[PDB]
């Protein structure tokens, strides 16, 4: 679930909302990295996304 990722962030209503937003952002970042790895694979390993994620 997303509560797992929310709890894997600190390791309070407004703080709870900010934590949920941060967990959603982390999951979106991971999905973008995996999609970049998929595009890299169609080009031809996930590191081609980690080094490209220097932003």
């Amino acid at each position: 679930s997303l509560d797992a990722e929310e709890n894997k962030l600190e390791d309070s209503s407004q703080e709870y909302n900010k934590k949920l937003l941060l967990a959603c952002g982390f999951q979106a970042i991971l999905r973008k990295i995996l999609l970049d790895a998929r595009t890299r694979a169609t080009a031809e390993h996930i590191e081609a996304a980690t080094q490209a994620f220097l932003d």
């Binding site: 679930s1 997303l2 509560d3 797992a4 999951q27």
Partner: protein, 713 residues
């Protein structure tokens, strides 16, 4: 009384605002604890209590969930106004309701769990309220916290495969593949497995099942629905005590276990919509119990699934009343020659005679069960199928119909039924005893059924004159030489005759009824032939009839047509059974007494000591010749004699031989006590015959009551 006390306690809990008592609220809560476990919190009280719990926040969520667990014990059926007050408090605040105070999700899951526990107490929804509830509960299934417990509600309500619309599957699957649910796959899979059972293969369902796969562990962990047994025990107690014969412990437990077994078995393994016009029309299939059938009676709706309600129980299931379906359809619309069970039964018979069915043995009891207890239908099956036309088609099926329908049938019009049944039975007699088809108990069995129908008639007056005439028209057929004989007799016909001869016996025994004795005396045509027959139990039936008909002929004078032939039967059946003097008398059975004398010439017998008197007694008549030997050899064993009569036949000749070859002991002892003369032996075997354990008791009874020589028994 008590319910007023409980209403007062709930009102004390409700108005407990703006006071903040230290412990008075605790005392009120304890009073509720102890008073809700006793009587059962009638449904308006439950509605007020759930409203108090969800809206107010005087007590914290711990005690609120605790009193949802241990106090929400309904005593009735959960009126549809309580389910709404629960649905109205499930959910979360939203842009449109940001000011509305949220109820704690733990309390909402507790309410859904309580709804699962008392699901067998839901009211029957009106075929459109059901279509709305089965969508409300699906939309409430998307909130994760109350998703483990709304899953059984979506499964139990998803009967009627019309409730498996794909827009539901678009929401089920969308929540299973969703990251942040953590318990959706093991619930979506159960809902899909239920939907699968309901609508067959449905490739969409099975391709959605293997997309959200559960690893056989957190699917079994979800099949096992753990209903609190303490709660259910208290609930069964409260229901049984509050409503006898309506929620008894056995049916409540069977129902709870049926629901749990549905949820468990999930993983192992309907005509058309018709625009339900009204908002309150409780369909018939949906009705689970009898109380719901009676509450929703004026609003009932019998659909046109006759082929389903007819063709193929302590649970309060939807099929709990499938045996009452056909009965509560002839009631809604009065029995009209166009009802569904009538026409269904008739069409199934028409397709059973013309062999257009796979297992008649499975649909014939369903026809006999609906028509034997309904005269308006039992009277049309008789007019349609009880004829020669449907007898040559199938005689094995018509016999079952006549054996289920005829025994109970009183005609509406006395007039034209005697001719009808005379024609029916004459046609059966002709068809059954035809050339090449010797006999297979078709006429004798159907005749037997008719005899039962005639008993039914005769039992109630206004038909006892029609009944007793059909009785004699049946006796005039069961005694025809082709089917009732002395050499080739086929005991079928002699066994449906002794039942007709007992319809009369029971009549002649009872008093206070109006029927001429013309209907009680059989007539020397048929009767003489019963006496000259050869089987012992038919002769016993004739003797039982003759002995139990004198108290009805004493009242009549001697110069009567029916007290002269009745005294003729006994004048000769007594000198054909005991006092063998058929040669000195005249006209034994209508046949002259010198016919026997001439027969006994050229009729070879080795000895000639006592020939003409050798075979005309109870010991020598070919009917009771060997039964008397058996009675003799049984008296010998009962006395432990030491001479052991050395032949089987009893007559004046062999007896003199047995008494001249063992004269020394016979005088001293070693044989039947009183037997010293042949007549002593014939009286001993008669006295042994009149013990009520053998079927031939009535011969001894008749001889005793009519001879006037051995009347001392």
């Amino acid at each position: 009384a008590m319910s007023l006390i409980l209403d007062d306690i709930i009102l004390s809990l409700t108005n407990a605002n703006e006071r903040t008592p230290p412990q008075a609220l605790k005392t009120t809560l304890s009073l509720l604890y102890e008073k809700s476990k006793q009587y059962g919190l009638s449904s308006p009280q439950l509605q007020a209590l759930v409203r108090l719990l969800c809206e107010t926040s005087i007590i914290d969520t711990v005690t609120k969930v605790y009193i949802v667990e241990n106090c929400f014990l309904p005593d009735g059926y959960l009126t549809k106004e309580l389910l709404l007050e629960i649905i109205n408090h499930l959910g979360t605040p939203t842009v449109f309701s940001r000011y509305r105070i949220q109820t704690p999700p733990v309390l909402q899951s507790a309410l859904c769990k309580w709804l699962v526990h008392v699901y067998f107490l839901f009211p029957v929804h009106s075929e459109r309220e059901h279509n709305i509830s089965s969508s409300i509960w699906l939309h409430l299934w998307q909130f994760s916290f109350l998703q483990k417990w709304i899953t059984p509600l979506v499964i139990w309500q998803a009967t009627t495969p019309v409730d498996v619309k794909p827009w539901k599957l678009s929401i089920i699957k969308r929540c299973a593949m969703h990251p942040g649910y953590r318990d959706a796959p093991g619930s979506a899979t159960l809902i899909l497995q239920r939907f699968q059972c309901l609508v067959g293969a449905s490739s969409q369902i099975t391709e959605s099942i293997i997309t959200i796969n559960c690893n056989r562990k957190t699917l079994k962990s979800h099949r096992n629905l753990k209903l609190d047994a303490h709660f259910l025990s208290i609930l069964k107690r409260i229901l049984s005590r509050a409503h006898p014969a309506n929620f008894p412990a056995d049916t409540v437990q069977n129902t709870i276990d049926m629901y749990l077994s549905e949820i468990h078995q999930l993983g192992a393994d309907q005509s058309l919509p018709e625009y339900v016009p009204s908002d309150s029309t409780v369909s018939l299939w949906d009705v689970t119990s009898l109380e719901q059938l009676a509450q929703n009676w004026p609003q009932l709706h019998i659909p046109n699934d006759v082929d389903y309600m007819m063709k193929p129980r302590k649970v309060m299931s939807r099929d709990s009343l499938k045996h009452l379906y056909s009965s509560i359809i002839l009631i809604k619309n009065s029995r009209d020659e166009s009802s569904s069970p009538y026409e269904w039964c008739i069409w199934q018979l028409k397709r059973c005679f013309a062999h257009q069915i796979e297992t008649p043995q499975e649909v014939i009891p369903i026809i006999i069960s609906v028509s034997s207890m309904d005269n308006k239908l039992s009277s049309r099956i008789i007019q349609t199928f009880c004829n020669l036309k449907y007898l040559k088609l199938d005689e094995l099926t018509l016999k079952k119909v006549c054996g289920g329908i005829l025994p109970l049938w009183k005609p509406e019009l006395i007039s034209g039924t005697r001719e009808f049944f005379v024609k029916f039975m004459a046609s059966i007699f002709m068809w059954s005893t035809r050339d090449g088809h010797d006999n297979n108990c078709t006429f004798s069995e159907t005749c037997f059924y008719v005899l039962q129908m005639i008993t039914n008639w005769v039992l109630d007056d206004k038909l006892i004159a029609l009944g007793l005439t059909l009785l004699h028209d049946m006796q005039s057929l069961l005694t025809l030489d082709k089917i009732f004989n002395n050499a080739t007799s086929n005991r079928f016909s002699t066994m449906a005759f002794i039942s007709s001869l007992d319809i009369l016996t029971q009549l002649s025994k009872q008093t206070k009824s109006d029927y001429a004795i013309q209907y009680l005396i059989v007539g020397p045509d048929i009767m003489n032939k019963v006496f000259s027959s050869d089987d012992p139990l038919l002769l016993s039936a004739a003797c039982r009839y003759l002995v139990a008909t004198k108290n009805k002929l004493m009242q009549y004078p001697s110069t009567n047509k029916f007290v002269r032939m009745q005294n003729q039967y006994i004048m000769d059946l007594t000198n054909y059974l005991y006092r063998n003097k058929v040669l000195s008398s005249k006209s034994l059975f209508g046949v002259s007494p010198d016919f026997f004398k001439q027969i006994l010439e050229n009729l070879y017998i080795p000895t000639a000591d006592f020939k003409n008197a050798k075979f005309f007694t109870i010991t020598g008549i070919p009917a009771l010749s060997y039964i008397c030997i058996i009675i003799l050899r049984r008296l010998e064993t009962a006395e432990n004699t030491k001479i052991k009569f050395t032949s089987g036949i009893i007559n004046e000749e062999t007896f003199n031989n047995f008494f001249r070859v063992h004269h020394d002991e016979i005088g001293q002892h070693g044989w039947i006590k009183g037997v010293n003369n042949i007549h002593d032996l014939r009286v001993k075997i008669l006295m042994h015959l009149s013990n009520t354990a053998n079927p031939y008791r009535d011969i001894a009874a008749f001889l005793f009551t009519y001879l006037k020589s051995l009347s001392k028994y």
